[PDB]
Design a protein around this ligand. Sequence first.
Ligand SMILES: Cc1cc2nc3c(=O)[nH]c(=O)nc-3n(C[C@H](O)[C@H](O)[C@H](O)COP(=O)(O)OP(=O)(O)OC[C@H]3O[C@@H](n4cnc5c(N)ncnc54)[C@H](O)[C@@H]3O)c2cc1C
Ligand SMILES: NC(=O)c1ccc[n+]([C@@H]2O[C@H](COP(=O)([O-])OP(=O)(O)OC[C@H]3O[C@@H](n4cnc5c(N)ncnc54)[C@H](OP(=O)(O)O)[C@@H]3O)[C@@H](O)[C@H]2O)c1
Length: 531
Amino acid sequence: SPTVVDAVVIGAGFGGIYAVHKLHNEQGLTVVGFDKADGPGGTWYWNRYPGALSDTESHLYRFSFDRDLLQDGTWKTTYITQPEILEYLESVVDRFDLRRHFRFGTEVTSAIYLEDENLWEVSTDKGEVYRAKYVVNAVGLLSAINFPDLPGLDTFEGETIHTAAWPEGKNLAGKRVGVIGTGSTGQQVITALAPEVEHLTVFVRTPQYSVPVGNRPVTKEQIDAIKADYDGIWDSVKKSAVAFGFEESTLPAMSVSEEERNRIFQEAWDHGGGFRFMFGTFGDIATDEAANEAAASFIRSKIAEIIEDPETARKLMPTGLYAKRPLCDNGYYEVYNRPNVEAVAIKENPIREVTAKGVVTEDGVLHELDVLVFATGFDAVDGNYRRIEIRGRNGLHINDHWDGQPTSYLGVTTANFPNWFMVLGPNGPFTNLPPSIETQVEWISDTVAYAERNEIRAIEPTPEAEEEWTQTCTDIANATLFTRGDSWIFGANVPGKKPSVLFYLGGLGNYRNVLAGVVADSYRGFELKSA
Ligand SMILES: Cc1cc2nc3c(=O)[nH]c(=O)nc-3n(C[C@H](O)[C@H](O)[C@H](O)COP(=O)(O)OP(=O)(O)OC[C@H]3O[C@@H](n4cnc5c(N)ncnc54)[C@H](O)[C@@H]3O)c2cc1C
Ligand SMILES: NC(=O)c1ccc[n+]([C@@H]2O[C@H](COP(=O)([O-])OP(=O)(O)OC[C@H]3O[C@@H](n4cnc5c(N)ncnc54)[C@H](OP(=O)(O)O)[C@@H]3O)[C@@H](O)[C@H]2O)c1
């Protein structure tokens, strides 16, 4: 005796919160949501590591769809910490009475399409079964935990924390900590842990490029000036490419004098923001090799000013293309001048084994550790889809459908899987994410309503349309240097995972233009089954 509902939503982050609001409050459908978390927040429920903070400016790292909720927003700094975002997202849940629609502490273990009924059968880890005509997957593009295995790790004194599963209230003051990982998460937790711990050991494998964040206090008059121009601010954001609120440059870097190139880089550096350094200074830093090297070397010279010990600056000096997700920090490079901060270059002096009481290097040197923080990445974009049994038409598994690379049509849809939608699924926009999540959930909500109104019982894309979208994303990505960034953005960070394109990099405005032309062209690329 399964529970019948119109729509199932998986995940209670940004995407699920909004999807439950659109499907129930606006369209009046019966909806059930799920999250293995005990409450809402998604990313910001799980990542409670110290230093966790958004690189989207405070006034734009939030929903834009409700004007009253925009005029009630509050914040203290130019950027916003994890406890502030979790609080904001919880406030959205109470504001729209969404809580009662969500089954928390529950994991969706299977999602099986029943063709003869045109219904999805969704079963959970608690034993309950549901049947729905629509399924909306908001399972998170940076959500499936990546946890590398090390020799003898099952045999260790003390705790092993992956940053995306940090226990609330855990403080490491006065302890002896090691951190592995030098991406955005590692930098934040290294910078936050340095003043409190008595010895920090950073196992650095690939040092990265990072600019100052510039997180400045915000006055009431500043907030009010933003609130009285919210419409135009969001209008410009949604028409732009990366949607961070700053003017995106079209000036080629090597077309100006060396002094002007320096002046522009130094202005962004002093202002702050990783995305602004990459896209707000010149227009070809991500597509022109000479422009990219000008940006990379300017950052290197700054790191050489900061880190006094030249041998310490050597291990932390980033080489190669400036083509990973732009990073910014609250004083990351100054940490290594502290006497109680050690850097270990893992590529020269590798990790050999985890002992009972610490980590041994091929140094013939053990580093004792009360705690070992894992600042490693995510099985990004497609990870949380491959972890569960998703079968569509003819019972074809999602892993067999996504045999090689994960694919979509327009980032929100895939073939053989009718009435089945993805928020931040494969081959979607690469922007400030809340306004791209809103764009997707809005199109998904409008597409369900169109099915309900015109009596369609199954919508799904054609293989021809899906392959056309893959090619469109592949051609655009091949015009950039991100394809050679060697990061999670192209699926190169998980061993066993085959690299591929994973993002449409045409920008949010072009993406929204593509979605609107698809709808106006009577859902071009979509097969409709009626009656
Ligand atoms: C530390 C950090 C900082 C970031 N900073 C920024 C930033 O400044 N700007 C920006 O644009 N983006 C940022 N991001 C990225 C992005 O904005 C967030 O990941 C965003 O909140 C995604 O929202 P979501 O709802 O799509 O997914 P998530 O927040 O990841 O929510 C997915 C949810 O689905 C649940 N789930 C998955 N599978 C199942 C299942 N089988 N059953 C039940 N529940 C399931 C998970 O528990 C999770 O709670 C950051 C990400 C991280 C990790
Ligand atoms: N906006 C924000 O402030 C913010 C903050 C945190 C996260 N994020 C988002 O989340 C993404 C991922 O961030 P993240 O830093 O958690 O992930 P990440 O970019 O994948 O970083 C993983 C780190 O772990 C290292 N590592 C991986 N496997 C290892 C192994 N087997 N042994 C040793 N070291 C290993 C990596 O080194 P290698 O490079 O050598 O592989 C890297 O330094 C970011 O790009 C960003 O989109 C955003």
